[PDB]
């Protein structure tokens, strides 16, 4: 199951460019519609609890054991940053933004994601 196709599919059929976007990992929430898909591919790889309130690192860990990595401790530092951040306004956005610019998580969290999330990331999107 690609999370990140199936809600592309069901919220951004008619917005190819925003997929663009998306699969460049080039987005915000300021761009209307951004943190509605993220928190819905969040919440449907098990990574978004409470709405896209809170991150289930453990369920990061477990999807990125088949590409070879533990970095869960890494993981729960960057998650408890983030949220130190941005508190009761966090949402999927926010973690993901998170994980993408912290070295310790950036690499791995992006080798998980392009790979078991191929199936969004891999079309001819732009």
Request: aromatic share 8%; charged share 20%; glycine share 14%.
């Given at each position: 199951v690609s999370h990140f196709k199936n809600c592309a599919d069901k919220q951004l059929s008619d917005d190819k460019p925003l997929q663009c976007k998306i699969r460049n990992l080039?987005?915000?929430?300021?761009?209307?519609?951004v943190k509605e898909y993220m928190n819905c591919a969040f919440e449907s790889s098990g990574w978004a609890k409470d709405g896209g309130k809170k991150l289930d690192t453990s369920k990061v860990a477990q999807d990125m054991v088949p590409y070879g990595f533990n970095i869960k401790t890494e993981l729960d530092e960057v998650t408890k940053e983030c949220e130190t951040e941005?508190?009761?306004?966090?949402?999927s956005i926010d973690y993901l933004a998170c994980l993408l610019i912290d070295e310790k998580t950036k690499t791995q969290f992006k080798t998980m994601l392009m790979m078991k999330e191929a199936d969004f990331f891999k079309q001819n999107l732009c």
């Open positions: 080039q987005v915000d929430g300021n761009m209307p519609k941005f508190g009761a306004e966090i949402s």
